[PDB]
A paper describes a structure:
During contraction, the diffocin sheath undergoes a transition from the alternating conformers B and C to a singular post-contraction conformer. The external diameter of the sheath increases from 19 nm to 22 nm, and the inner diameter increases from 8 nm to 10 nm, which enables the detachment of the sheath from the tube. Four β-strands from three neighboring sheath subunits jointly form the conserved handshake β-sheet. In contrast to the pre-contraction sheath, the post-contraction sheath exhibits evidently subtle motion, as revealed by the three-dimensional variability analysis of post-contraction sheath segments. The helical twist and rise of these segments vary within the ranges of 27.61–28.97° and 25.36–26.72 Å, respectively. This is in line with the increase of entropy from the metastable, higher energy pre-contraction state to the lowest energy post-contraction state. The shape of the diffocin in the pre-contraction state mirrors a syringe, and its typical length is about 146 nm. During contraction, the sheath layers of the trunk are compressed by about 47 nm.
Here, we report the atomic structures of an engineered diffocin, a contractile syringe-like molecular machine that kills the Gram-positive bacterium [name]. Captured in one pre-contraction and two post-contraction states, each structure fashions six proteins in the bacteria-targeting baseplate, two proteins in the energy-storing trunk, and a collar linking the sheath with the membrane-penetrating tube. Specific attachment of baseplate tail fibers to receptors on the surface of a target bacterial cell triggers conformational changes of the neighboring baseplate, which leads to reorientation of sheath proteins and contraction of the entire sheath assembly. Since the sheath and the tube are anchored together at the opposite end by the collar, collapsing the sheath pushes the tube through the baseplate, driving it to puncture the cell wall and underlying cytoplasmic membrane.
Residue numbers in the entry:
A (entry chain B): 2 to 354
B (entry chain J): 305 to 354
C (entry chain K): 254 to 304
D (entry chain C), E (entry chain N): 204 to 253
Write the structure that this text describes.
């Protein structure tokens, strides 16, 4: 309709955008006390609630010291004594995190936490990890650090109490580098123990602290799983590889659910656009040197053919290209190949005169 | 259309398919069509091998 | 051994370019030692293909 | 919107508010542009000259 | 940081502390530069002149 003359000038900003990916470097911390119960949200190193016990403050201080840099965010939840673990566990399932730790826990608590982690990593499709004092849990979700009588600052520490420092050390490092052979200037002595014993413990999936060169260092941080199926390969035993896999999973899932779920029609061209977006994300990750340069993503073919045959359609004469043409009805099948890099660990040099 | 023509008693044994389609129907129209309806993506299955 | 353990262990990703950089560093150290007249002038370092 | 022609006070002085014609209903024959004074005037002069 | 303009005693005399605007939320089109008095002022003058 004809209205009054319109003169409008609009001002907008060039919204230069880098996509917000899943946060990494957050630590889930749980502790039991009668003061300041619940989460405490220690985002900053300096600020600490005062009603907490001094010893627990020491535990926080061990938690804060990062490996290369300070942990991005620290979440400490205070629980009432004897309230069991589930009461805290639901609270933690409410929010996101990366690593969980318990200074004070009986073996029943460790069993409960390990069962929770295994069920959560496979049922709820959420990738989290936790460090435990002494467990033989055979999953990728737990790291078993085991060293007795650790002396930090003239004070003795058991393994369970030191797990906080181990978790902070793990979360401090960037994804580019690894944890193996990292100096811990805080610790000043460990009970003496031989090299072949270290070989035996490391081959068990156990994480051990070693005295080598001038300082005190972690000896080849590895996972806890020991049996190697045809499904779970050797590389699943390294912390760095499983961590970058978790990050990849979280980012891909977040993108998929946030944009392409229930908003775009299931057609071949939309599949191509989704593949292009996935490949763009993979190339962006490759730029940061976490995976190899060349990777490929392609629509899964055999699963699609099996799905069509399960529906009774006759696919005898249609060509492979026509097979990929076929409608699937709100189902998408894709496969992708990547190669994960690792940090230098063993160097073999041969010099002849 | 063939069934309707049979119902009125016309003898269509010899008449060929195009001639059957040609026959008058008297204000009756019979049509059939086929389509395929798209849907939004709902379930995504991604398989990655290292 | 001291250089390798201090700088290149658990801090550099295993890639072709990183290996080339390590080779360059090793060759630089060898040349520096050659300046002190302990080895002959020309020395070569390269990736061990057979192993 | 009624086809009414009005006078509006805006900016410094008094100004005419988008001089339009009087017709309001738009047929398939009489399009939108027949509502502007300038267009109908140039159509009239074209008609008279030809 | 709360979008408030404050008076600060520092150096020899009393001076303004980074004169900023009252808006605090940042949207997609309202970027960072929309928080400065000088920038919004020159934008306003451009709008009026044009």
């Amino acid at each position: 309709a004809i209205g009054l003359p319109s003169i409008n000038i609009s001002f907008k900003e060039l919204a230069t955008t880098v996509k917000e990916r899943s946060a990494r470097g957050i630590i889930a911390m749980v502790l039991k006390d009668a003061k300041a119960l619940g989460l405490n949200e220690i985002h900053e190193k300096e600020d600490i609630p005062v009603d907490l016990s001094a010893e627990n403050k020491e535990y926080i201080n061990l938690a804060l010291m990062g490996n290369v840099n300070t942990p991005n965010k620290l979440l400490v939840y205070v629980i009432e004594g004897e309230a069991d673990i589930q009461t805290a566990l639901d609270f933690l399932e409410t929010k996101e995190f990366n690593y969980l730790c318990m200074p004070k826990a009986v073996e029943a608590d460790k069993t409960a936490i390990k069962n929770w982690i295994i069920k959560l990593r496979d049922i709820d499709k959420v990738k989290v990890k936790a460090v435990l004092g002494k467990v033989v849990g055979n999953h990728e979700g737990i790291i078993n650090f085991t060293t007795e009588d650790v002396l930090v600052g003239e004070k003795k520490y058991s393994v369970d109490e030191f797990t906080s420092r181990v978790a902070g050390l793990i979360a401090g490092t960037p994804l580019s580098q690894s944890v193996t052979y990292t100096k811990l200037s805080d610790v000043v002595d460990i009970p003496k123990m031989t090299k072949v014993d270290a070989e035996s413990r490391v081959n068990k999936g156990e994480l051990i602290l070693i005295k080598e060169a001038g300082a005190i260092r972690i000896a080849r941080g590895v996972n806890s799983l020991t049996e190697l199926t045809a499904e779970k390969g050797e590389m699943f035993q390294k912390i760095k590889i499983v961590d970058t896999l978790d990050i990849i999973h979280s980012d891909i899932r977040k993108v998929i659910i946030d944009d392409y779920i229930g908003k775009v029609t299931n057609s071949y061209d939309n599949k191509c656009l989704l593949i292009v977006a996935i490949k763009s994300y993979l190339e962006e990750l490759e730029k940061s040197a976490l995976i190899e340069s060349d990777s490929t993503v392609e629509i899964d073919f055999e699963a699609q053919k099996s799905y069509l045959k399960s529906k009774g359609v006759d696919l005898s004469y249609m060509t492979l290209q026509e097979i990929k043409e076929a409608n699937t009805g709100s189902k998408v099948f894709l496969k992708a190949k990547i190669k994960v890099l690792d940090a230098m660990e063993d160097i073999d040099l041969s010099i002849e005169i």
